[PDB]
Structures are given as structure tokens and as C-alpha cells.
Amino acid sequence: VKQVRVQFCPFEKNVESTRTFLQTVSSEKVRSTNLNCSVIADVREPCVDVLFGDGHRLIMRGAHLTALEMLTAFASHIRA
């Protein structure tokens, strides 16, 4: 992992999937070992971007997805 950006619009219809996602994985309890990552939360249907400096950009439209699905996708991508 190199960088991650979380964006969502609770001003519009809420999407708890990405909210739980950022509450869980975007926490220092994980970043302490995953120090290589840089998290940013730019909030304004949602969108979670993950930039890997090697060759990968991951874009998650976590509108109909849920926290477990997106967490598993993120873990699988990290494993690569």
C-alpha cells in the first residue's frame, strides 16, 4: 500500500459501507504496522481510491457494496 483516498457524501443519501470502511481500516491500529500507507479523507456514489506506486490504481464504488466486501477486496489487492 502507498496511498488511499476516501470520499463520500453524507449530505446526500448516506452510505454506511464506506463510513465503516474508513472507521475500521483507516485507523492507526492498522497503520502502526502499515506505516507505508498515506490515508486521506476528502468528503463532499461514494469513491475509495488506492494508489500503488508500482502499477495499480484501485477504485471502489462502495455504494451497493458493504464493509466486509470492500475490506476483503482491499486485503486481496494488498496481498497481490
Q: Which residues bind another protein (CB under 8 A)?
A: 6, 10-11, 13-14, 16, 19-20, 22-23, 26-29, 38-44, 56, 58-61, 63-65, 69, 73, 77
Nearer to another protein, 54 or 59 (CB): 59
Nearer to another protein, 1 or 60 (CB): 60
Reading the block at residue 78, the C-alpha cell is 494488498
Instruction: Provide the residue type at 1 as one letter.
Output: V
Nearer to another protein, 71 or 73 (CB): 73
User: 3-state class of 75 per DSSP?
Assistant: helix
Sign of the CA dihedral with 24 first, then 29, 34, and 39 last: positive
